Amino acid sequence: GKLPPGPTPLPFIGNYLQLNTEQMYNSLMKISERYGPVFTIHLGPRRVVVLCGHDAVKEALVDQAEEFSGRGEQATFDWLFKGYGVAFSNGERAKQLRRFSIATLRGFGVGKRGIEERIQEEAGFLIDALRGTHGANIDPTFFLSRTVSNVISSIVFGDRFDYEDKEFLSLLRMMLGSFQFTATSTGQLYEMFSSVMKHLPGPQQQAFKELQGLEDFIAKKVEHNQRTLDPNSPRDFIDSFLIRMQEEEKNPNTEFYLKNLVMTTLNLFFAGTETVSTTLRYGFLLLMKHPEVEAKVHEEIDRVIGKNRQPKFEDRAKMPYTEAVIHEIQRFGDMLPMGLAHRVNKDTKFRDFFLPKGTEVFPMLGSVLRDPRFFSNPRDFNPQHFLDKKGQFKKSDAFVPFSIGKRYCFGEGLARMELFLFFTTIMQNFRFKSPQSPKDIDVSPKHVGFATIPRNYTMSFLPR
Ligand code: HEM
Ligand SMILES: CN(CCCC(=O)c1cccnc1)N=O
């Protein structure tokens, strides 16, 4: 009959006094130690029920999947999305957009054997660009992002970008900056205080222009497809969506119309770029700091695949150690520490608590990736976390970086394959050197907010 207990809030500022916007995850975790694994917090005027640990997150998003499947808010993005598109929508809109996106994506080979050649081909170009650096110290950021991005770009636009295309880099800076903004102290103040801050000068204004620039580029690309549309030969995700829009022109209550097309396409292009990219970046830093772990990956690539042929997704089954390393890089990297907010569809009873309809919910995936009964050394980089006695791959019920339940990341299939093919191909060809001794390397995060951003760094790609 009652809400989950929590610290007393003040009018408008909510629980701003018990929260440090530079490290929200730590704040919310401190409050958990006092109040328990399920609690109520006020992010400014927003009432949020917070879930910590494997159990409370699973009992909500799995055992009570339908009730907890609404989408909560993410102030910075909502500035742009305003409830349109697959990722920021609710109800019938979310369900039609999701069901359309998963089937259309699957049809383009995504998550099946079909997108595979295209990932091997794009790995190949990156190896080439990496030879082109001659072993210099470089910031790997945009090298990796061009590559990852071209995979989803093919799928939604129809072709990859040239690596030297200047607009491309521009787009890549718009993504990086706006995503990175949500990880900052001001980006977290924005979650609490968007009603005033959207009208105030600050880094938020940069993030908006960057988003608006990403929306404008998508709208332009859609006009191009629209005035060259062959329904009997869809080139890409946008064409498919436009074809379904044609089919649904005589339904006045359809979710399939321009704004949703533009917003869904952005959702896929932005998420299909930024997360995998950052995960690669984080992981190459984790590997230079754990050279012995790098070297056991090497041993597997060398024994199982060798130096001549391209790696393939099927090789994973005989590479338990690489697979554990990628898993443990995703775990340690904790890309979305509070996932995407949810909300409850209706009046919901959850363990003795009552949650009124529309109550926001933070599933704290970071606290699942660090739950001390599922991982022996949660705050350490330890690949043994996903390995048994024998050295065979050991799955974990608490490996939840793509979230779980009805709104789980349907990019998961693409990501798993991109990470696997991108790590093995890169490391088949190059071992890594930083201008720092392993002891000096700081793998603690630069920013922690909506996302976990690794620190700035440089490295060299040295042929093996
Ligand atoms: C390692 C890389 C990735 C991570 C860690 C990740 C993580 C997540 C997480 C935690 C969510 C929230 C699920 C929830 O609301 O409970 C999500 C949603 C989503 N992700 Fe990803 N993702 C990754 C890659 C991708 C890729 C490659 C795509 C493109 C296909 C993508 C597209 C989406 C979309 C469209 C949603 C919204 C789902 C919905 O609202 O129904 N993600 N992702
Ligand atoms: C990047 N991450 C999703 C973050 C929220 C999201 O899905 C999103 C955010 C901005 C634009 N498009 C999608 N998913 O992999």
UniProtKB/Swiss-Prot annotation:
Keywords per UniProt: Endoplasmic reticulum, Heme, Iron, Membrane, Metal-binding, Microsome, Monooxygenase, Oxidoreductase
Pfam families hit by this protein: p450 (PF00067)
Any one of the GO CC terms: endoplasmic reticulum membrane
One Gene Ontology term of the molecular function aspect: arachidonate epoxygenase activity
InterPro entries listed in its UniProt record: Cyt_P450 (IPR001128), Cyt_P450_CS (IPR017972), Cyt_P450_E_grp-I (IPR002401), Cyt_P450_E_grp-I_CYP2A-like (IPR008067), Cyt_P450_sf (IPR036396), Cytochrome_P450_fam2 (IPR050182)
Phenotype for R227C: In allele CYP2A13*2
Impact noted for substituting F270I: Decreases phenacetin O-deethylation activity 40 fold
Places the protein is found: Endoplasmic reticulum membrane; Microsome membrane
Function: Exhibits a coumarin 7-hydroxylase activity. Active in the metabolic activation of hexamethylphosphoramide, N,N-dimethylaniline, 2'-methoxyacetophenone, N-nitrosomethylphenylamine, and the tobacco-specific carcinogen, 4-(methylnitrosamino)-1-(3-pyridyl)-1-butanone. Possesses phenacetin O-deethylation activity.
Listed name of the protein: Cytochrome P450 2A13
